[PDB]
Amino acid sequence: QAKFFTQATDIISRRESLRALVALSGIAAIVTYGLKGAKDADLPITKGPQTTGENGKGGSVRSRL
Amino acid sequence: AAQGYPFVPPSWAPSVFVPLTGLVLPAIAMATLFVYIEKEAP
Amino acid sequence: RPMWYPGATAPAHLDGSMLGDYGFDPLRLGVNKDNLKWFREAELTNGRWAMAAVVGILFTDAVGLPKFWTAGAEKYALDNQTLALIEVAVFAVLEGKRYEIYKKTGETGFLSFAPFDPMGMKSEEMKLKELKNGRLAMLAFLGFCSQAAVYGKGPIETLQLHLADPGHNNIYTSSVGPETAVTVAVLCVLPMIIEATKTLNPGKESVPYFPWNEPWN
Amino acid sequence: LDPQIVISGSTAAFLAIGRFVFLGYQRREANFDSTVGPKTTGATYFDDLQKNSTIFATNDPAGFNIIDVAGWGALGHAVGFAVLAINSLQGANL
Amino acid sequence: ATKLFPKFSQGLAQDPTTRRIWYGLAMAHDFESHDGMTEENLYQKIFASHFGQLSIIFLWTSGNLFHVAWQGNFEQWVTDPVHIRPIAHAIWDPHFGQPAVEAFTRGGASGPVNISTSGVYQWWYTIGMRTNQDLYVGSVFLALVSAIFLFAGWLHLQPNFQPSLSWFKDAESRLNHHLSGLFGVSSLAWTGHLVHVAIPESRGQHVGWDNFLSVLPHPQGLTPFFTGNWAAYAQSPDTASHVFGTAQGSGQAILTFLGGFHPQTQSLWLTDMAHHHLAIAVIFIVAGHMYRTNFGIGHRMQAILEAHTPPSGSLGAGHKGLFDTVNNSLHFQLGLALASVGTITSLVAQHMYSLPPYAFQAIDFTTQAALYTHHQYIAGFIMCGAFAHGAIFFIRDYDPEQNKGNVLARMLDHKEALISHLSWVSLFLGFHTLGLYVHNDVMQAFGTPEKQILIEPVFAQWIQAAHGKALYGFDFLLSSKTSAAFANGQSLWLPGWLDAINNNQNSLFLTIGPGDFLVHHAIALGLHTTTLILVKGALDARGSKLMPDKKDFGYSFPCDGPGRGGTCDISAYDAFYLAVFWMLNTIGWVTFYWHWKHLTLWQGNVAQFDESSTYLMGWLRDYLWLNSSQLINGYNPFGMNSLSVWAWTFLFGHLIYATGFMFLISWRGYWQELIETLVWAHEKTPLANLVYWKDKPVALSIVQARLVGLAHFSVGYIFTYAAFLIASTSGRF
Amino acid sequence: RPTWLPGLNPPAHLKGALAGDNGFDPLGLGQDEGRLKWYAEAEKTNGRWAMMAVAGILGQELLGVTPAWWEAGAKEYDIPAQALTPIEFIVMGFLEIKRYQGFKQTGTSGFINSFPFDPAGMNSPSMATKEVKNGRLAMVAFIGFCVQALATRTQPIEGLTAHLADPFGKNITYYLTHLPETL
Ligand code: CLA
Ligand code: CLA
Ligand code: CLA
Ligand SMILES: CCCCCCCCCCCCCCCCCC(=O)OC[C@H](CO[C@@H]1O[C@H](CO)[C@H](O)[C@H](O)[C@H]1O)OC(=O)CCCCCCCCCCCCCCCCC
Ligand SMILES: CC1=C(/C=C/C(C)=C/C=C/C(C)=C/C=C/C=C(C)/C=C/C=C(C)/C=C/C2=C(C)CCCC2(C)C)C(C)(C)CCC1
Ligand code: SF4
């Protein structure tokens, strides 16, 4: 087990290399989150309003668009 | 790029750049400026 | 030695010791020397795979075969998942031995042939030719995918389209026209900004304030 | 209204009072040079941008160089176009 | 050991604590307190920093243009600009619920968006933009301009371009050029734009880059100009039947002198705007040929200053020695600049609402409110900084021997009179304004509104009637039909001016009553007291009887100890600090008065202001409590609407303000001992003492936490009022 | 030396060692020794480009080209402008990058690698004065071309023949007015 987990961390056992992995994996995860993941999570910001919205009710007095 | 005036951003540009600017660039910046401020003069 | 733009002064870390050193590192990604070794091995590996991929896409589009961005969706003798499984399984040992050969030698190798050299034609000239053709092939594969993304055609049908009307069938008359035009313009005028940086600070190298650069030194 | 006549009269009159009337006063006032001496004592290119690098020397017996004529003719053209504008709307208030 | 972050200060880089980080963040732009800084290097770093600020400003405008062009509805807004809302940008918030997406879908958008209150829509529509492509191109151009300025800031830091110190100290040519080219030729080019592009685009004719060398601004091009027949350019103005953006009742004139407002936009004409910037251009170009340069003619400012010594020395040595005082002091020039800039920002605010320049403004009520409150708070902050830097001048740059007997030393010689008289004015105004307000409050409480001290502001009403407002019947100057001032301008600005000032539907010289009296005197109280605090800090910046060696401690020092009775908040920095509170209160009074007067005007209910503004429960109930109804119901347990963001922001500012109270009331020494305990707790906790700090945890210093409390306070103040303003105005309208 | 103004002494920073020195620097921009070395080559380059520019305008209108010189961009060629701009940038960037690196060393002009270019043996200080003076003439004449056709006006030689047809009726005073008649 020690050999496994010493070998599994060899490529990242340095500061700059682990920061490179973090940067790569996180940029990728967040970019693919914006591209597919927020849609797969069915976030409301991805679905849109699915209605008319608060367009015509600009104000109680002047119902602007 | 887009029809009409080119250099219109895509539809997915907010979905990418809002997470970037808010999760990534602040991470890079705060890490860099942390390693800078805790760095010792030789 | 020649440079990436005429009359370019190389960075202090790209002192021509390595091959293909045209002094190109405007972002100073190769300030660390071990990072530079890893990046050289990565350059040559990305380039080897892009050489094989460019020649493979060429051989595929040369004959009546599915297009390279749709060839994955065809039906094969194995299932998708077992294909990926066996691929990962054999590349485990392959890339492990290659990483071990990098850690031991500093260059690539197949499994145990530290220098995969059946026919002993290894030279610095051949190393430079491999590096140059690999860079060229990375560009070529990027172009394959890019002018297969704008059009629905692969390399050579798009080449024949450019040959049909060179002035009207080019990258500046497609959807990516304007951005490539402005990008090329900026890249043409850039080296004079860089040369001003070199001129008005004669002999003094400048640090571009990047995280990978450790600019506080 | 003859704009040429008005503007030429204005410019010539202002140049005449600038050469014959308001030249000695302008030469007395323009030369302080008592405590207000040089602006600069430096030697760099930005210190020479304040120095009279070019002295416009004229052959006029009173020293009416190109800058004096430029300024007095600018005032003349200004007052002439003012007179032409005030007449252009064919009226005056008081 | 010694750290690396404060490259500009070696005393901070050796600090083992967390004070290094903060003080290096807060001493970064005090270039004259840097290590190894010379005067020339100071001026050069400031030059480069100004270039950077310019680049940032232009990038900011490019971003506004880009987001309005991309995520906005400008091509849709120009069609129906009285009923379509301006879109600032779109919202991609992954935290949104479905109701929030359903709610922020405004202005005809396909998704959540923010309704712009910045007025950029009206401005860009007035100056000739009708297309999203125009704003795209303008954004590209301003980003290129920002790039140019950034490159120039790098360039003028280079050895062969690093300007000399005397080049910065050269004031005559800088003034000549910044008066002619930067001010008058800029106005000339803006007049060229108005005439060529904005006016014809207002007349329906599209004039772009592709045809502005092919079409004419006037049917008789330049013949009227070169032959002095300049009235031909005021030939056919835009009629009162004119509708903006089309050629219905268009007109052909380009330089008119109509005065007043366009009847359809309720805004200024573009033609007298053109004539305005033309006259301004000529006046500023003639003004720019004043000071002495390399050509033998002009003035030397030192001579004008030194010659301006009155007989009887009623001013002492006059202005002798002031040229070297202003030239060699950057804080003096900065304070003059901030004074002038804040005063003209107040002018922008006071004039942009009464004389609204941009089309379809005055009908976008939230835009007017945001613009006024914005520029007024900006002005207040800038004007506080003016006096702050005047204090820093007195400390760091003032030489008493080079100013021996001039006006600037004469100020310090009678500083006690200035401070005591400002204190008297503030004291009288506060006593009496609060007394009248409390009196009217008690009279309303006791059921007797007829016993209030309602003083009719007849001086301001007399002024208004001198301007031609016939509501009061002074019949003085321009309301007097049989006067000279009336009869002379009648072929000019007057008809439009009187049609615009006698109309009570616009903000041009609103009618005023005793509530206006009382609140203008509150405004005087705030101004006089703010400038009392600031002037006092500036003059006692160098010394007091409690501390005559105050200049030897700098501008911002914590205190002089508990000795001599106590010396807390004795610096000039702390005087500015205490004045920021009174400034925020002053501008809050100003903007409350504006917002309520205009909320009652826009609702047709000016009687509510004329009745309720004379006592402070009117201001509480009928303004703060009444108009909060939709704001705080932005979200309820039943649901939410688009005002929920402003509700959340309201509560946000209420949190930040109160959090500043924590740094404002509790002081350092409770917190340092608390942090000592927490240091023990961290050093003795197992599995967590493994992790240790590199910077020693200390409490925020005295000056630092003063600044932090002031910043939390100001941010909460500003955010709370911005939320309330935008929500109470957008909720109704 | 014959100066730009009679009786005017030439300034101290302009010694008569350069090519087109007439003592004309009423502003004082040539007071840095390195900025003058840049301004000299800038003069020569602006002047060479303006020389070939007026040559190209006069040659375009001497021959039977379709549009005016100002309308020549809005025209259908074999290659679109959006495709001509980047090719131009590549080629001219090559040429001018090679031109600067070649002004850094040896401090004089040149084409690509030959600094100075001079394939023929025609380099003389007299020829330098000729170059600089005809180049200043060309720059001012090109600005005259641009503003002489500032609207839809006459082309250069066409305007010359129009001035020669009526000297007292076709001049600056006629075309600064009558501008509606031109458009
Ligand atoms: C291996 C390099 C290579 C080569 C030989 C070509 C060649 C070609 N490309 Mg491809 N291309 C490349 C790289 C390359 N491209 C890359 C890296 C990209 C991604 C940006 C593209 C993206 C692209 C698009 C989107 C389009 C083309 C098109 C074309 C054709 C017209 C040229 C043009 O408008 O594009 C100019 C190409 C660029 C600006 C990309 C950079 C090219 C670099 C600088 C290399 C240039 C060649 C190199 C100096 C020598 C090649 C080696 C050898 C074959 C002689 C032509 C067949 C167009 C076409 O065929 O439409 C009908 C088209 O629409 N290409
Ligand atoms: C043209 C304008 C101008 C210029 C050039 C300067 C320049 C300077 N000022 Mg002056 N100043 C100005 C305007 C200006 N100021 C104004 C408008 C005010 C009144 C507000 C002041 C008040 C003032 C004081 C009281 C002092 C200075 C000082 C200084 C010097 C250093 C500044 C510093 O410490 O940087 C670093 C500054 C900071 C890091 C600022 C702190 C952060 C601020 C408060 C913003 C916080 C907002 C927050 C982030 C918003 C979050 C929102 C979110 C919640 C949604 C420098 C010479 C100092 C000096 O010279 O020392 C002797 C000094 O003591 N200035
Ligand atoms: C509601 C809060 C409030 C009030 C009323 C005041 C009031 C005052 N401040 Mg301000 N101030 C405040 C908050 C407040 N401040 C805050 C939060 C700060 C930030 C720390 C400051 C910072 C500050 C500075 C830095 C300065 C002032 C000054 C002043 C005085 C200005 C002169 C004036 O208007 O006299 C009118 C006075 C009043 C309206 C208050 C008295 C109230 C009534 C009339 C008194 C009698 C009531 C009653 C009969 C007595 C009952 C008592 C007993 C019998 C039970 C005045 C006492 C200036 C000063 O002292 O100059 C003179 C000054 O330099 N203040
Ligand atoms: C240092 C050098 C290292 C080299 C290592 C060896 C690489 C070997 C690559 C595969 C070569 C197999 C080709 C055999 C002859 C086929 C002739 C033919 O008619 O093809 C015909 C075939 C297509 O034929 C199709 O076959 C399919 C198989 O299920 C289906 O049945 C289809 O119906 C049929 O049409 O063409 C190819 O498959 C060529 C593809 C070659 C590349 C495959 C991907 C490999 C990329 C990674 C390589 C990894 C290298 C390390 C792993 C190996 C380690 C020992
Ligand atoms: C501390 C100090 C400083 C600062 C200060 C300040 C900040 C001040 C401010 C001030 C101010 C802020 C002022 C203001 C003023 C104003 C004025 C002075 C006004 C006037 C007006 C008038 C005069 C008017 C007239 C008229 C009328 C009435 C109306 C109509 C028109 C006419 C014109 C007729 C400095 C830095 C300098 C330094 C020293 C000290
Ligand atoms: S600031 Fe604090 S420590 Fe200093 S005198 Fe005041 S109370 Fe005492």
mmCIF file of N, CA and C in Angstrom, chain D residues 1 3 26 29-33 35-40 42 44 46-54 56 65 67-68 71 75 81-82 84-85 88-90 93-94, chain E residues 156 160-170 172-173 225-232 286 292-300 302-303 306 488-489 491-492:
data_model
loop_
_atom_site.group_PDB
_atom_site.id
_atom_site.type_symbol
_atom_site.label_atom_id
_atom_site.label_comp_id
_atom_site.label_asym_id
_atom_site.label_seq_id
_atom_site.Cartn_x
_atom_site.Cartn_y
_atom_site.Cartn_z
ATOM 1 N N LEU D 1 -21.944 93.845 -46.719
ATOM 2 C CA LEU D 1 -21.175 93.813 -45.482
ATOM 3 C C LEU D 1 -19.694 93.623 -45.800
ATOM 4 N N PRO D 3 -17.203 90.941 -45.990
ATOM 5 C CA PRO D 3 -16.346 90.412 -44.920
ATOM 6 C C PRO D 3 -14.873 90.699 -45.107
ATOM 7 N N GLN D 26 4.125 96.108 -24.354
ATOM 8 C CA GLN D 26 4.277 94.662 -24.398
ATOM 9 C C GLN D 26 5.722 94.253 -24.187
ATOM 10 N N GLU D 29 6.336 94.689 -20.350
ATOM 11 C CA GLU D 29 5.672 93.700 -19.513
ATOM 12 C C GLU D 29 6.198 92.296 -19.782
ATOM 13 N N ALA D 30 6.520 91.992 -21.037
ATOM 14 C CA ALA D 30 6.954 90.651 -21.397
ATOM 15 C C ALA D 30 8.323 90.318 -20.835
ATOM 16 N N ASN D 31 9.100 91.326 -20.466
ATOM 17 C CA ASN D 31 10.421 91.135 -19.878
ATOM 18 C C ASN D 31 10.329 91.420 -18.382
ATOM 19 N N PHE D 32 10.098 90.375 -17.588
ATOM 20 C CA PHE D 32 10.191 90.526 -16.137
ATOM 21 C C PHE D 32 11.641 90.372 -15.692
ATOM 22 N N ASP D 33 12.193 89.171 -15.887
ATOM 23 C CA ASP D 33 13.628 88.902 -15.786
ATOM 24 C C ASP D 33 14.286 89.601 -14.594
ATOM 25 N N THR D 35 13.275 88.581 -10.797
ATOM 26 C CA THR D 35 13.340 87.353 -10.017
ATOM 27 C C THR D 35 12.853 86.155 -10.807
ATOM 28 N N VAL D 36 11.911 86.374 -11.720
ATOM 29 C CA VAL D 36 11.452 85.337 -12.627
ATOM 30 C C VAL D 36 12.431 85.283 -13.786
ATOM 31 N N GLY D 37 13.454 84.450 -13.651
ATOM 32 C CA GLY D 37 14.481 84.337 -14.654
ATOM 33 C C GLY D 37 14.229 83.156 -15.566
ATOM 34 N N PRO D 38 15.102 82.152 -15.532
ATOM 35 C CA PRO D 38 14.858 80.954 -16.332
ATOM 36 C C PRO D 38 13.890 80.009 -15.644
ATOM 37 N N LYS D 39 13.137 79.282 -16.468
ATOM 38 C CA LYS D 39 12.311 78.204 -15.943
ATOM 39 C C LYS D 39 13.156 77.016 -15.515
ATOM 40 N N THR D 40 14.300 76.815 -16.163
ATOM 41 C CA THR D 40 14.993 75.541 -16.113
ATOM 42 C C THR D 40 16.498 75.757 -16.069
ATOM 43 N N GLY D 42 18.402 72.619 -16.324
ATOM 44 C CA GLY D 42 18.796 71.262 -16.619
ATOM 45 C C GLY D 42 19.432 71.125 -17.987
ATOM 46 N N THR D 44 18.781 67.808 -19.812
ATOM 47 C CA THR D 44 18.155 66.710 -20.519
ATOM 48 C C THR D 44 17.204 67.244 -21.585
ATOM 49 N N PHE D 46 14.181 66.967 -22.018
ATOM 50 C CA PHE D 46 12.951 67.544 -21.497
ATOM 51 C C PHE D 46 13.182 68.904 -20.866
ATOM 52 N N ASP D 47 14.430 69.229 -20.537
ATOM 53 C CA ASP D 47 14.772 70.561 -20.068
ATOM 54 C C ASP D 47 14.961 71.532 -21.218
ATOM 55 N N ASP D 48 15.296 71.028 -22.403
ATOM 56 C CA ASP D 48 15.438 71.862 -23.583
ATOM 57 C C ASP D 48 14.111 72.140 -24.268
ATOM 58 N N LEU D 49 13.069 71.376 -23.951
ATOM 59 C CA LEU D 49 11.743 71.657 -24.480
ATOM 60 C C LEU D 49 11.164 72.943 -23.913
ATOM 61 N N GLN D 50 11.752 73.469 -22.842
ATOM 62 C CA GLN D 50 11.329 74.728 -22.254
ATOM 63 C C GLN D 50 12.238 75.883 -22.638
ATOM 64 N N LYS D 51 13.377 75.601 -23.256
ATOM 65 C CA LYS D 51 14.303 76.646 -23.647
ATOM 66 C C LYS D 51 13.911 77.209 -25.004
ATOM 67 N N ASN D 52 14.214 78.488 -25.205
ATOM 68 C CA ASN D 52 13.967 79.140 -26.486
ATOM 69 C C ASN D 52 14.992 78.606 -27.480
ATOM 70 N N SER D 53 14.717 77.400 -27.978
ATOM 71 C CA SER D 53 15.634 76.755 -28.908
ATOM 72 C C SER D 53 15.755 77.538 -30.206
ATOM 73 N N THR D 54 14.667 78.162 -30.647
ATOM 74 C CA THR D 54 14.650 78.966 -31.857
ATOM 75 C C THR D 54 14.208 80.371 -31.489
ATOM 76 N N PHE D 56 13.128 83.656 -33.135
ATOM 77 C CA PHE D 56 12.635 84.143 -34.420
ATOM 78 C C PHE D 56 13.111 85.575 -34.603
ATOM 79 N N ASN D 65 8.357 90.455 -34.689
ATOM 80 C CA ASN D 65 8.704 89.172 -35.277
ATOM 81 C C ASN D 65 7.435 88.409 -35.633
ATOM 82 N N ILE D 67 5.925 86.036 -34.169
ATOM 83 C CA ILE D 67 5.001 85.730 -33.084
ATOM 84 C C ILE D 67 4.155 86.945 -32.738
ATOM 85 N N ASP D 68 4.742 88.139 -32.754
ATOM 86 C CA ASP D 68 3.955 89.341 -32.509
ATOM 87 C C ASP D 68 2.888 89.517 -33.578
ATOM 88 N N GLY D 71 0.125 86.839 -33.139
ATOM 89 C CA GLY D 71 -0.811 87.119 -32.068
ATOM 90 C C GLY D 71 -1.709 88.305 -32.346
ATOM 91 N N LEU D 75 -5.781 88.226 -32.835
ATOM 92 C CA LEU D 75 -6.758 89.098 -32.193
ATOM 93 C C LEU D 75 -7.557 89.878 -33.228
ATOM 94 N N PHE D 81 -14.167 88.663 -37.082
ATOM 95 C CA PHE D 81 -15.228 87.676 -37.172
ATOM 96 C C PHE D 81 -16.312 87.937 -36.140
ATOM 97 N N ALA D 82 -15.958 88.534 -35.002
ATOM 98 C CA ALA D 82 -16.978 88.930 -34.039
ATOM 99 C C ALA D 82 -17.876 90.008 -34.617
ATOM 100 N N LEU D 84 -18.415 90.520 -37.732
ATOM 101 C CA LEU D 84 -19.189 89.921 -38.811
ATOM 102 C C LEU D 84 -20.334 89.071 -38.280
ATOM 103 N N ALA D 85 -20.129 88.401 -37.147
ATOM 104 C CA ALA D 85 -21.194 87.614 -36.536
ATOM 105 C C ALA D 85 -22.287 88.508 -35.973
ATOM 106 N N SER D 88 -24.205 89.585 -38.689
ATOM 107 C CA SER D 88 -24.812 88.520 -39.476
ATOM 108 C C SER D 88 -26.275 88.324 -39.111
ATOM 109 N N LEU D 89 -26.633 88.546 -37.848
ATOM 110 C CA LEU D 89 -28.020 88.530 -37.419
ATOM 111 C C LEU D 89 -28.642 89.918 -37.445
ATOM 112 N N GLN D 90 -28.011 90.857 -38.150
ATOM 113 C CA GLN D 90 -28.607 92.131 -38.538
ATOM 114 C C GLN D 90 -29.179 92.906 -37.359
ATOM 115 N N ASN D 93 -28.135 94.559 -29.379
ATOM 116 C CA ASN D 93 -29.001 94.726 -28.215
ATOM 117 C C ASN D 93 -28.792 96.083 -27.548
ATOM 118 N N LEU D 94 -27.568 96.363 -27.113
ATOM 119 C CA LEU D 94 -27.260 97.634 -26.473
ATOM 120 C C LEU D 94 -25.755 97.884 -26.494
ATOM 121 N N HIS E 156 7.049 55.845 -21.189
ATOM 122 C CA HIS E 156 7.546 56.992 -20.459
ATOM 123 C C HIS E 156 8.066 56.622 -19.095
ATOM 124 N N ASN E 160 15.297 56.562 -21.888
ATOM 125 C CA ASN E 160 15.419 57.639 -22.858
ATOM 126 C C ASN E 160 14.141 58.446 -23.000
ATOM 127 N N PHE E 161 13.073 58.038 -22.325
ATOM 128 C CA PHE E 161 11.806 58.740 -22.361
ATOM 129 C C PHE E 161 11.353 59.183 -20.984
ATOM 130 N N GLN E 162 12.037 58.756 -19.934
ATOM 131 C CA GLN E 162 11.725 59.169 -18.579
ATOM 132 C C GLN E 162 11.826 60.685 -18.505
ATOM 133 N N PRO E 163 10.714 61.392 -18.358
ATOM 134 C CA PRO E 163 10.771 62.851 -18.370
ATOM 135 C C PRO E 163 11.567 63.391 -17.201
ATOM 136 N N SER E 164 12.113 64.581 -17.406
ATOM 137 C CA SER E 164 12.852 65.248 -16.355
ATOM 138 C C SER E 164 11.898 65.823 -15.321
ATOM 139 N N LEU E 165 12.468 66.204 -14.186
ATOM 140 C CA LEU E 165 11.676 66.803 -13.126
ATOM 141 C C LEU E 165 11.170 68.175 -13.535
ATOM 142 N N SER E 166 12.009 68.950 -14.215
ATOM 143 C CA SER E 166 11.613 70.285 -14.627
ATOM 144 C C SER E 166 10.521 70.249 -15.676
ATOM 145 N N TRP E 167 10.460 69.180 -16.462
ATOM 146 C CA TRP E 167 9.392 69.046 -17.438
ATOM 147 C C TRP E 167 8.049 68.902 -16.747
ATOM 148 N N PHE E 168 8.031 68.229 -15.599
ATOM 149 C CA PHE E 168 6.817 68.166 -14.801
ATOM 150 C C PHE E 168 6.548 69.498 -14.128
ATOM 151 N N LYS E 169 7.598 70.146 -13.642
ATOM 152 C CA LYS E 169 7.450 71.445 -13.007
ATOM 153 C C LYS E 169 7.193 72.564 -14.002
ATOM 154 N N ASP E 170 7.269 72.290 -15.303
ATOM 155 C CA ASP E 170 6.918 73.288 -16.306
ATOM 156 C C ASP E 170 5.406 73.415 -16.370
ATOM 157 N N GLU E 172 3.647 76.408 -17.472
ATOM 158 C CA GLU E 172 3.093 77.348 -18.433
ATOM 159 C C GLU E 172 2.701 76.643 -19.721
ATOM 160 N N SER E 173 3.560 75.759 -20.220
ATOM 161 C CA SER E 173 3.228 75.025 -21.430
ATOM 162 C C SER E 173 2.214 73.929 -21.168
ATOM 163 N N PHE E 225 -19.543 80.311 -43.162
ATOM 164 C CA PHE E 225 -18.463 80.405 -42.190
ATOM 165 C C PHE E 225 -17.363 81.335 -42.671
ATOM 166 N N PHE E 226 -16.896 81.134 -43.897
ATOM 167 C CA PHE E 226 -15.765 81.890 -44.404
ATOM 168 C C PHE E 226 -16.147 83.283 -44.871
ATOM 169 N N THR E 227 -17.439 83.602 -44.925
ATOM 170 C CA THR E 227 -17.906 84.941 -45.260
ATOM 171 C C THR E 227 -18.578 85.634 -44.084
ATOM 172 N N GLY E 228 -18.407 85.115 -42.874
ATOM 173 C CA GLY E 228 -18.908 85.768 -41.687
ATOM 174 C C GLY E 228 -20.411 85.788 -41.535
ATOM 175 N N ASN E 229 -21.157 85.180 -42.455
ATOM 176 C CA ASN E 229 -22.614 85.109 -42.348
ATOM 177 C C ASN E 229 -22.994 83.925 -41.463
ATOM 178 N N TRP E 230 -22.634 84.058 -40.191
ATOM 179 C CA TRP E 230 -22.771 82.958 -39.251
ATOM 180 C C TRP E 230 -24.202 82.731 -38.802
ATOM 181 N N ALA E 231 -25.077 83.718 -38.954
ATOM 182 C CA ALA E 231 -26.470 83.500 -38.602
ATOM 183 C C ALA E 231 -27.156 82.545 -39.561
ATOM 184 N N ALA E 232 -26.602 82.350 -40.757
ATOM 185 C CA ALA E 232 -27.159 81.367 -41.675
ATOM 186 C C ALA E 232 -27.098 79.963 -41.106
ATOM 187 N N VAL E 286 -8.436 80.549 -27.139
ATOM 188 C CA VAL E 286 -7.901 81.876 -26.889
ATOM 189 C C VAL E 286 -7.316 81.958 -25.491
ATOM 190 N N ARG E 292 3.623 81.753 -21.063
ATOM 191 C CA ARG E 292 4.855 81.853 -21.827
ATOM 192 C C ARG E 292 5.406 80.480 -22.167
ATOM 193 N N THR E 293 5.742 80.301 -23.437
ATOM 194 C CA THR E 293 6.365 79.082 -23.926
ATOM 195 C C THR E 293 7.601 79.493 -24.722
ATOM 196 N N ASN E 294 8.112 78.577 -25.502
ATOM 197 C CA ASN E 294 9.342 78.744 -26.251
ATOM 198 C C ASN E 294 9.253 79.817 -27.339
ATOM 199 N N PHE E 295 8.216 80.654 -27.401
ATOM 200 C CA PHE E 295 8.007 81.545 -28.536
ATOM 201 C C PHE E 295 8.059 83.019 -28.164
ATOM 202 N N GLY E 296 8.472 83.350 -26.949
ATOM 203 C CA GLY E 296 8.771 84.713 -26.584
ATOM 204 C C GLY E 296 7.606 85.519 -26.055
ATOM 205 N N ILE E 297 6.376 85.109 -26.330
ATOM 206 C CA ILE E 297 5.205 85.821 -25.851
ATOM 207 C C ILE E 297 4.527 84.985 -24.780
ATOM 208 N N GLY E 298 3.722 85.655 -23.968
ATOM 209 C CA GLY E 298 2.926 85.006 -22.956
ATOM 210 C C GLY E 298 3.209 85.556 -21.581
ATOM 211 N N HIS E 299 2.640 84.881 -20.591
ATOM 212 C CA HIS E 299 2.811 85.229 -19.193
ATOM 213 C C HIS E 299 3.664 84.183 -18.494
ATOM 214 N N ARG E 300 4.439 84.629 -17.516
ATOM 215 C CA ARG E 300 5.079 83.749 -16.553
ATOM 216 C C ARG E 300 4.276 83.817 -15.263
ATOM 217 N N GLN E 302 4.756 83.017 -12.287
ATOM 218 C CA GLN E 302 5.436 83.563 -11.123
ATOM 219 C C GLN E 302 5.333 85.075 -11.092
ATOM 220 N N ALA E 303 5.342 85.710 -12.263
ATOM 221 C CA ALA E 303 5.239 87.158 -12.321
ATOM 222 C C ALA E 303 3.840 87.627 -11.960
ATOM 223 N N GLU E 306 3.577 87.122 -8.102
ATOM 224 C CA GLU E 306 4.390 88.042 -7.323
ATOM 225 C C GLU E 306 3.962 89.489 -7.505
ATOM 226 N N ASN E 488 -33.954 92.097 -24.283
ATOM 227 C CA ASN E 488 -32.727 91.937 -25.050
ATOM 228 C C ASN E 488 -32.548 90.506 -25.539
ATOM 229 N N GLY E 489 -32.878 89.530 -24.706
ATOM 230 C CA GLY E 489 -32.727 88.133 -25.041
ATOM 231 C C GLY E 489 -33.936 87.484 -25.669
ATOM 232 N N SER E 491 -35.156 87.514 -28.748
ATOM 233 C CA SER E 491 -34.815 86.857 -29.999
ATOM 234 C C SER E 491 -33.792 85.752 -29.799
ATOM 235 N N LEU E 492 -33.539 85.383 -28.550
ATOM 236 C CA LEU E 492 -32.496 84.402 -28.274
ATOM 237 C C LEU E 492 -32.981 83.248 -27.418
#
